[PDB]
Design a protein around this nucleic acid. Structure first.
Lengths: 45, 97, 127, 61, 421, 204, 41, 133
DNA sequence: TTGT
DNA sequence: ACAACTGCGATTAC
RNA sequence: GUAAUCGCA
């Protein structure tokens, strides 16, 4: 269960999302989520 | 079941993130992580003292973690050690970028 | 990575930038699955910022402003269409939500799908 | 890894054989140097660990 | 197809597992099978003796109903908003004696509270007919109990429930309270569910460590046994209740997972709270006023009982199969039988024979006191295949007590026989 | 305040954001018959009844109506203080309820079933009032127009009601682009007005 | 840490006894620091 | 927390409980009165502290486990970050119209002449199509 | 030097 | 009288 | 093994 965002994502929004993911799923899932996000970000850049 | 999640799970298993998941699962059942570290160290020391020649390419700490995971109902390879079936031949090593 | 994410989730030209004349005198693509939209983007059928409609399976997790429907179409038979800013919610006389279509771009659905698939792949690899 | 001559000598043997490396109990050469220096300065320094079991003082040299 | 205790029953609905699953409840290695008595938990995998416990159930805290034991009533599954008069009803209760009332009120409000797991879970809960508690019992059942003390206590508990319902749920009460229990039968059923499915465990959430009474879903579907295979452990980091198999025990496919309620209580408390009785209860007490005293050491020797008086078990290793007469019944007998131990003095056969004959006479007297026999009770039981669960529980309690007395007589006879070898 | 607690089993309970509306229901097979003679408004989840503001002539006879809801979804971000604490909270937040009388009080299962878009009753939670909507019939035919081809367009936060033919409708993309273009034009003119050359200029 | 000779002379004349309940004390002595894994519980 | 917080008969949070963002939001919503919390100040020792006096660990989000050295951590967490007249303008081109009798003449600090204002005044920028105040 |  | 960033690497001069 | 001097980040 994750929200769907239709607005611009910035550094503060990313930090908030990472904190909420650490709170909900824990650091273990957040590590893989962050790796996938980094891969997608590099690809799109 | 997502249709296009084969390669992701394959890479998660091959890379070694299973070890991190198992460490988190075993730390979710312990009050103080320092005592858990000391217990794992003592168990690995006992394993090494029991069979010296057994280890050297297989890690006793990974063996302890795999035994603890297998005793909990989760199947894990012995000491999290896997071999590449697609290796070309002897003396050929993969280059991990 | 921040630049890539910002380009993904930035949005699209909405007002005078997308159209030269007022549409009063007178978006198009409809995708049932996110996989179809991502495949169409890979095949260069639709651009990164090109708007589209995506059908959702009764979740209503899209964050948006507390804004009433801009226009509501009610037919004789009982089915009323509620047009919102970023989504369309068709319902019937029985107050039953028949269909929900989200209006977004490939970037937002790509980010959502990659996060969801990371979580699901972690959960599957655990077993 | 730094200063303990005996332990360091034993580390290579234990690694080549494969046995577990015991925890060093003796003071490093840096501490021993200090003691020697301070005692050249006419100042003493003794470890003097006390056993909780039998209440005995044991000097570590 | 090997015959197993799970095979005789039928599998449960897929939905029962599913509602928990979408809410993070997880089950590993177990299957839920429904039957005439009710839902039960069975194994679906062969488990060899393990060094440490294995978690079969992980039950989150957000699906549970928990009330603290002490005076500050803290609802960690906080479904009751502030200012609601249901808290005024809950707080207007004695802290020590009456705890089922607050759990019943909380369960009723959870049934009323929207988007709650208990709203869906109540459908699988046993109905008024399926419930075996003696609160939902007629006077005929209490009379058939043939025990005046237990019948009086159950009647007093029913009276307390009715009085509490009549006091708190008056006409002037707001509609939000009235819709909870419009009829007193609903409140009695809520109290029955609270009493028959309550767990008393110590839980730690955040920095606070407290003891509380909790209603945990999917953990009340495990039956009772005096040799348990699992226990209710608590995990504070994930804030989940976990059921773990006992370490060093071998579980085979088809076995029934069981947990122990009230370890060390007589059948009276079981029949009072859960409406259940067991013939092999090792803690049953039979009041014998005879001056005679049997020898405890020779009794435990001839019946191969080893351990301290606080922990008795049959050493089947010395038993070498054969004797299966030994069970919890003889343990409860040795516990309740009058015994004498004077250093290392050896027992006298004539005195012990007089003692066992006096005990057999007293046991025959006590058995004649009940206006029924084991065969009559068994015939009445088999004669009624479908009937009230309370009457069946009553006749089963009678039959279990009669069988316990008969087995005490038989054990005394076997002792008298084997002492002379 | 009426000071007597009514039996809500014989009433239609309509929930709003800040109010609850009760309308008496005559015995009927399908719960679509409304009696507007007796009606009450209550605070959210409160048993203290009151009399609503009748701001329009209400029907004094039994009529068959269809209920609808108008509002906006409030998707918030609740603070996470637990491991499995929810990531989001979604609320419907109904604001206005529309009651559309069935044509000739016909049942839904009848072979000929149509909604009478000329008799609309709205309920507002903010004002605690029920009134009759003002529609603007623009479909040719006057009062003899067939009801099988009608479309009720509701705009301006439930304040504009228009009856137009079904074929003469705009797709959601069209109205979304229209509103976006209008807002963008207004904002762009507001931004460019401050420039010292806005007077001698041309919007192209 | 700042005035080594002064505090050394003062402790020498007094005869102070230090119980190694601190981190740098075990660091200088070259032993297990009573922090984390070094804290016996 | 070191003392229970009561809003009427109900207790929002008891003693020895770890405050969280939800608890703070509930407190600011219910307008709680001064709250008693634990702190390294109220500890009973100066050589060491306890888990409850310190509180939640900054690393993971639970009570500090026994053996953790919070002293060093605080020093590093303090040292590492140690490295780091409104002017009204005309909205459009136009004439200015205002009543000069209400304003008092004065001399600005820039040597220019100006009108001092001490009471709410309305000035109108008269443009081709609109008026601004 | 700069300040302690 | 006392102290004023952390380390690394290169050279030449004793 | 110590100094001097420069560079590095």
């Amino acid at each position: 269960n994750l929200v769907f965002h239709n607005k611009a994502i910035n550094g503060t929004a990313m930090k908030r999302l990472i904190s909420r993911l650490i709170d909900h799923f824990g650091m273990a899932y957040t590590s893989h989520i962050l790796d996938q996000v980094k891969t997608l970000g590099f690809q799109q850049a | 079941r997502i249709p296009f999640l084969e390669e992701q799970v394959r890479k998660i298993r091959d890379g070694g993130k299973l070890l991190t998941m198992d460490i988190h699962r075993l730390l979710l059942n312990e009050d103080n992580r320092f005592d858990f570290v000391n217990e794992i160290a003592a168990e690995a020391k006992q394993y090494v003292e029991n069979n010296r020649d057994e280890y050297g390419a297989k890690k006793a700490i990974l063996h302890v973690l795999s035994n603890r995971m297998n005793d909990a109902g989760v199947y894990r390879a012995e000491a999290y050690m896997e071999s590449d079936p697609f290796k070309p031949g002897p003396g050929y090593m993969k280059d991990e970028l | 990575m921040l630049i890539g994410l910002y380009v993904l989730t930035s949005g699209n030209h909405r007002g005078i930038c997308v159209n030269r004349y007022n549409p009063c005198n007178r978006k198009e693509p409809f995708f049932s699955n996110s996989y179809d939209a991502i495949g169409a983007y890979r095949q260069k059928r639709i651009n990164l910022d090109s708007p589209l409609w995506l059908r959702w399976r009764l979740d209503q997790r899209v964050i948006a402003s507390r804004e009433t429907p801009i226009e509501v179409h009610y037919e004789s038979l009982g089915t009323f269409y509620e047009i919102y800013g970023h989504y369309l919610i068709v319902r019937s006389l029985k107050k039953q939500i028949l269909f929900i279509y989200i209006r977004t771009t490939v970037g937002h659905i790509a980010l959502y799908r990659e996060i969801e698939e990371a979580i699901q792949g972690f959960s599957r690899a655990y077993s | 890894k730094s200063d303990h001559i005996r332990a360091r000598q034993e580390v290579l043997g234990t690694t080549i054989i494969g046995g577990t490396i015991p925890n060093p109990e003796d003071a490093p050469e840096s501490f021993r140097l200090l003691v020697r220096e301070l005692r050249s300065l006419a100042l003493e320094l003794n470890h003097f660990l006390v056993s909780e079991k039998n209440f005995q003082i044991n000097r570590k040299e | 197809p090997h015959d197993t205790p799970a095979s005789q029953l039928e599998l449960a609905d897929p939905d029962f597992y599913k509602i928990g699953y979408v809410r993070s409840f997880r089950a590993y290695g177990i299957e839920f099978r429904e039957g005439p008595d009710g839902y039960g938990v069975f194994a679906s995998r062969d488990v060899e003796p393990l060094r440490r416990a294995r978690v079969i159930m992980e039950i989150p805290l957000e699906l549970m109903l928990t009330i603290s034991k002490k005076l500050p009533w803290m609802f960690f599954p906080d479904i009751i908003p502030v200012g609601h008069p249901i808290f005024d009803i809950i707080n207007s209760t004695n802290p020590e004696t009456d705890s089922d009332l607050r759990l019943a009120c909380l369960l009723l409000y959870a049934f009323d509270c929207k988007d709650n797991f208990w709203q869906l879970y109540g459908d699988f809960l046993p109905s008024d007919d399926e419930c075996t508690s003696f609160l939902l019992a007629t006077e005929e059942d209490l009379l058939e109990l043939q025990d005046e003390k237990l019948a009086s206590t159950m009647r007093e508990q029913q009276q307390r429930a009715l009085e509490f319902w009549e006091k708190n749920w008056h006409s002037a009460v707001p509609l939000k309270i009235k819709r909870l229990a419009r009829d007193p039968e609903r409140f009695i059923w809520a109290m029955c569910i609270a009493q028959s499915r309550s767990i008393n465990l110590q839980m730690r959430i955040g920095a606070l460590v407290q003891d509380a009474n909790l209603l945990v879903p999917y953990a009340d579907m495990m039956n009772h046994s005096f040799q348990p295979n699992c226990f209710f452990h608590w995990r504070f980091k994930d804030r989940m209740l976990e059921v773990m198999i006992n370490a060093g025990q071998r579980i085979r496919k088809g076995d029934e997972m069981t947990v122990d309620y009230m370890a060390g209580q007589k059948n009276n408390f079981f029949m009072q709270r859960y409406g259940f009785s067991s013939p092999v209860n090792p803690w049953d007490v039979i009041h014998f006023t005879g001056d005679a005293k049997i020898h405890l050491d020779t009794f435990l020797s001839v019946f191969n009982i080893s351990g301290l008086p606080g922990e008795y078990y049959h050493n089947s290793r010395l038993s070498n199969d054969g004797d299966s007469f030994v069970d919890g019944a003889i343990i409860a007998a040795a516990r309740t039988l009058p015994t004498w131990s004077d250093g290392d003095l050896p027992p006298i056969p004539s005195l012990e024979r007089k003692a066992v004959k006096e005990l057999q006479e007293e046991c025959h007297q006590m058995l004649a006191e009940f206006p029924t026999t084991s065969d009559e009770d068994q015939k009445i039981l088999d004669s009624m295949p479908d009937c009230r669960r309370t009457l069946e529980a009553a006749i089963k309690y009678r039959l279990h007590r009669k069988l316990l007395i008969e087995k005490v007589i038989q054990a005394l006879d076997i002792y008298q026989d084997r002492i002379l070898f | 305040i009426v000071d007597y607690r009514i039996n809500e089993e014989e009433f239609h309970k309509i929930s709003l954001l800040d109010c609850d509306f009760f309308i008496r229901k005559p015995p009927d097979p399908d719960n679509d018959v409304y009696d507007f003679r007796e009606m009450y408004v209550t605070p959210p989840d409160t048993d203290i009844y009151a009399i609503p503001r009748v701001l329009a002539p209400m029907p004094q006879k039994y009529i068959r109506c269809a209920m609808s809801d108008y509002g906006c979804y409030n998707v918030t971000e609740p603070p996470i203080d637990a491991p499995r604490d929810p990531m989001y909270k979604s609320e419907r937040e109904v604001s206005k309820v529309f009651l559309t009388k069935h044509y000739r009080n016909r049942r839904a299962g009848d072979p000929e079933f149509a909604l009478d878009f000329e008799e609309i009753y709205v309920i507002d939670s903010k004002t605690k009032s029920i009134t009759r909507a003002k529609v603007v019939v623009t479909v040719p035919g006057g009062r003899n127009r067939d009801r099988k081809n009608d479309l009720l367009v509701i705009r301006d936060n439930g304040n504009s009601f228009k009856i137009i033919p079904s074929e003469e409708r705009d797709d959601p993309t069209t109205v979304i682009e229209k509103e976006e273009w209008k807002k963008s034009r207004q904002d762009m003119e507001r931004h460019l007005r401050k420039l010292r050359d806005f007077s001698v200029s041309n919007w192209f | 840490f700042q005035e080594t000779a002064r505090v050394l002379a003062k402790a020498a004349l007094r005869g102070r006894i230090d119980w190694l309940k601190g981190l740098k004390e075990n660091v200088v002595l070259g032993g297990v620091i009573p922090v984390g894994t070094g804290f016996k519980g | 927390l070191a003392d229970d917080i009561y809003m009427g008969p109900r207790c929002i949070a008891t003693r020895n409980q770890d405050i969280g963002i939800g608890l703070v939001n509930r407190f600011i919503t219910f307008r709680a009165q001064p709250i008693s919390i634990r702190t390294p100040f109220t500890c009973r020792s100066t050589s060491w502290i306890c888990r409850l006096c310190y509180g939640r660990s900054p690393t993971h989000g639970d009570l500090v486990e026994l053996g953790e050295a919070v002293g060093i951590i605080a020093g590093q967490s303090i040292g590492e970050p140690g490295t780091q007249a409104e002017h009204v303008r005309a909205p459009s081109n136009g004439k200015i119209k205002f009543n000069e009798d209400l304003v008092h003449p004065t001399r600005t600090r820039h040597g220019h002449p100006a009108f001092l204002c001490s009471i709410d005044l309305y000035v109108t920028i008269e443009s081709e199509d609109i008026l601004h105040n």
